[PDB]
Short mmCIF file of C-alpha atoms in Angstrom, two decimals:
data_model
loop_
_atom_site.label_atom_id
_atom_site.label_comp_id
_atom_site.label_asym_id
_atom_site.label_seq_id
_atom_site.Cartn_x
_atom_site.Cartn_y
_atom_site.Cartn_z
CA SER A 64 -78.67 28.93 88.40
CA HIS A 65 -82.28 29.07 87.08
CA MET A 66 -82.10 25.55 85.62
CA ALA A 67 -78.99 24.28 87.39
CA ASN A 68 -78.64 20.80 88.79
CA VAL A 69 -79.26 20.36 92.55
CA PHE A 70 -76.94 18.68 95.09
CA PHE A 71 -77.43 17.30 98.61
CA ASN A 72 -74.42 16.52 100.78
CA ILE A 73 -75.45 13.42 102.68
CA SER A 74 -74.31 12.12 106.07
CA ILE A 75 -75.41 8.73 107.40
CA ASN A 76 -75.20 8.19 111.17
CA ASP A 77 -73.06 11.34 111.42
CA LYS A 78 -70.50 10.30 108.82
CA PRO A 79 -70.22 12.08 105.47
CA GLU A 80 -71.04 9.86 102.50
CA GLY A 81 -70.60 12.33 99.65
CA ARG A 82 -73.14 14.08 97.46
CA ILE A 83 -76.24 13.24 95.46
CA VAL A 84 -76.80 15.34 92.31
CA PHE A 85 -80.16 15.66 90.58
CA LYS A 86 -81.16 16.75 87.10
CA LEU A 87 -84.60 18.33 87.35
CA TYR A 88 -87.18 18.12 84.58
CA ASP A 89 -87.54 21.88 84.00
CA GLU A 90 -88.68 21.01 80.46
CA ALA A 91 -91.75 19.15 81.73
CA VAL A 92 -92.69 20.41 85.19
CA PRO A 93 -90.92 23.75 85.68
CA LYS A 94 -93.06 24.94 88.64
CA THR A 95 -92.40 21.70 90.48
CA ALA A 96 -88.67 21.77 89.72
CA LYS A 97 -88.48 25.42 90.82
CA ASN A 98 -89.95 24.53 94.20
CA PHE A 99 -87.41 21.77 94.88
CA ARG A 100 -84.52 23.84 93.53
CA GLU A 101 -85.24 26.93 95.66
CA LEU A 102 -85.82 24.84 98.81
CA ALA A 103 -82.40 23.32 98.15
CA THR A 104 -80.75 26.73 97.68
CA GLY A 105 -82.52 28.04 100.78
CA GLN A 106 -82.81 31.39 98.98
CA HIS A 107 -86.11 32.24 100.65
CA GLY A 108 -84.62 31.70 104.11
CA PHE A 109 -85.84 28.12 104.64
CA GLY A 110 -85.48 24.79 102.91
CA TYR A 111 -83.91 21.39 102.85
CA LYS A 112 -80.57 22.14 104.53
CA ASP A 113 -80.27 20.07 107.75
CA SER A 114 -83.41 18.02 107.03
CA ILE A 115 -83.44 14.20 107.08
CA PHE A 116 -84.93 11.21 105.30
CA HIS A 117 -87.73 10.00 107.57
CA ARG A 118 -88.95 6.97 105.61
CA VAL A 119 -86.91 4.40 103.69
CA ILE A 120 -88.51 1.29 102.20
CA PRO A 121 -86.10 -1.18 100.54
CA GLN A 122 -86.99 -1.99 96.91
CA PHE A 123 -89.31 1.00 96.80
CA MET A 124 -88.11 4.45 97.84
CA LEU A 125 -86.44 6.99 100.12
CA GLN A 126 -88.64 9.83 101.41
CA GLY A 127 -87.57 13.20 102.76
CA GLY A 128 -88.19 16.91 102.44
CA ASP A 129 -89.90 17.63 105.78
CA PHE A 130 -87.82 20.62 106.86
CA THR A 131 -90.51 21.95 109.25
CA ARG A 132 -91.30 18.99 111.53
CA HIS A 133 -88.45 16.65 110.55
CA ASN A 134 -90.51 13.46 110.81
CA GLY A 135 -92.87 13.26 107.83
CA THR A 136 -95.69 15.42 109.28
CA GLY A 137 -94.59 18.76 107.80
CA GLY A 138 -93.04 20.60 104.84
CA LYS A 139 -94.25 23.62 102.94
CA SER A 140 -93.65 24.87 99.42
CA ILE A 141 -92.18 28.10 98.04
CA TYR A 142 -95.74 28.80 96.82
CA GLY A 143 -97.40 28.47 100.24
CA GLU A 144 -98.74 25.53 102.22
CA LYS A 145 -99.30 23.49 99.06
CA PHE A 146 -99.45 23.53 95.28
CA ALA A 147 -101.31 21.80 92.41
CA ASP A 148 -100.21 18.69 90.51
CA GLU A 149 -98.47 20.35 87.55
CA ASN A 150 -98.92 17.44 85.16
CA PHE A 151 -98.23 13.72 84.93
CA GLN A 152 -96.14 13.84 81.75
CA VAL A 153 -93.26 11.84 83.20
CA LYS A 154 -93.99 8.33 84.50
CA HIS A 155 -92.19 6.32 87.19
CA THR A 156 -90.32 4.15 84.69
CA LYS A 157 -86.85 3.73 86.21
CA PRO A 158 -85.01 3.70 89.56
CA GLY A 159 -83.62 6.97 90.89
CA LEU A 160 -86.50 9.31 90.01
CA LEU A 161 -87.62 12.32 92.07
CA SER A 162 -91.37 12.36 92.62
CA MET A 163 -93.50 14.53 94.92
CA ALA A 164 -94.95 12.96 98.01
CA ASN A 165 -98.53 14.07 98.61
CA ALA A 166 -101.68 13.60 100.68
CA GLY A 167 -104.06 13.38 97.76
CA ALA A 168 -104.64 15.36 94.59
CA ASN A 169 -103.04 18.82 94.49
CA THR A 170 -101.34 18.68 97.88
CA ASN A 171 -97.65 19.04 96.94
CA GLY A 172 -95.51 20.70 99.60
CA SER A 173 -91.82 19.96 100.09
CA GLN A 174 -91.74 16.22 100.77
CA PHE A 175 -90.34 14.14 97.94
CA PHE A 176 -89.18 10.64 97.30
CA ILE A 177 -86.40 9.01 95.37
CA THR A 178 -87.51 5.74 93.88
CA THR A 179 -85.22 2.72 93.87
CA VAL A 180 -87.37 0.81 91.37
CA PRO A 181 -89.93 1.62 88.68
CA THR A 182 -93.18 2.43 90.53
CA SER A 183 -95.83 2.56 87.81
CA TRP A 184 -98.67 2.23 90.33
CA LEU A 185 -97.91 5.84 91.31
CA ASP A 186 -98.31 7.08 87.73
CA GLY A 187 -100.95 9.79 87.45
CA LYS A 188 -100.91 10.14 91.24
CA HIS A 189 -97.47 11.53 92.05
CA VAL A 190 -95.65 14.18 90.01
CA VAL A 191 -92.26 13.02 88.69
CA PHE A 192 -89.90 15.96 88.43
CA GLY A 193 -86.31 14.77 88.14
CA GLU A 194 -83.61 12.10 88.41
CA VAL A 195 -80.41 11.30 90.32
CA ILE A 196 -77.41 11.68 88.02
CA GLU A 197 -74.74 11.25 90.66
CA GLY A 198 -74.70 9.44 93.98
CA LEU A 199 -76.79 6.36 93.16
CA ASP A 200 -74.40 4.44 95.46
CA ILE A 201 -75.51 6.69 98.34
CA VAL A 202 -79.16 6.10 97.41
CA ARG A 203 -78.58 2.33 97.47
CA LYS A 204 -76.67 2.51 100.77
CA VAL A 205 -79.46 4.50 102.40
CA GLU A 206 -82.04 2.09 100.90
CA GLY A 207 -80.24 -0.82 102.55
CA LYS A 208 -80.76 0.83 105.96
CA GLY A 209 -84.55 1.04 105.83
CA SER A 210 -87.15 -1.62 106.57
CA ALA A 211 -90.39 -2.95 105.11
CA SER A 212 -92.24 -0.74 107.62
CA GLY A 213 -90.43 2.32 106.25
CA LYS A 214 -88.90 3.08 109.64
CA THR A 215 -85.12 3.41 109.91
CA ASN A 216 -82.59 3.76 112.74
CA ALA A 217 -80.16 5.52 110.41
CA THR A 218 -79.95 9.32 110.59
CA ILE A 219 -79.70 10.32 106.96
CA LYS A 220 -79.13 14.05 106.86
CA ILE A 221 -78.82 16.68 104.20
CA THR A 222 -75.81 18.54 105.66
CA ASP A 223 -75.68 21.04 102.79
CA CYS A 224 -77.52 21.58 99.50
CA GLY A 225 -78.06 24.00 96.64
CA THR A 226 -77.13 24.15 92.96
CA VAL A 227 -74.04 23.00 91.11
#
């Protein structure tokens, strides 16, 4: 499963909505894809399973990946507390891209976002590393439950995850 697609099973407000499947850009940013993939498999004994999406901004993005503090304050990578920006080869040109959340240059951890629009203002600032290939309806349904402020009253949970 070295370059296998990744799935999340998603529940919203405790009800199962189905699965999101991602194709990761191993051919552009392998180190960044590896991180996401192995956090999804949980093979190191920690990772995305049971984490939630803590920020959802309609017409912008869904953000998640904080499996340590579960509120946007945490996350860690398979490489340690953080890792470098691999490259900015792929730009934010279409909805449904995976891109690393960060706190400045070279501060990638485990938090990620799924865009719901092109976000070219993030180009050269956030590392794009994959795309949703199944479950865009779930992405849109989650998106519809956020707010301009980014806060949401929906519990959007990754109930299981790994490779397919």
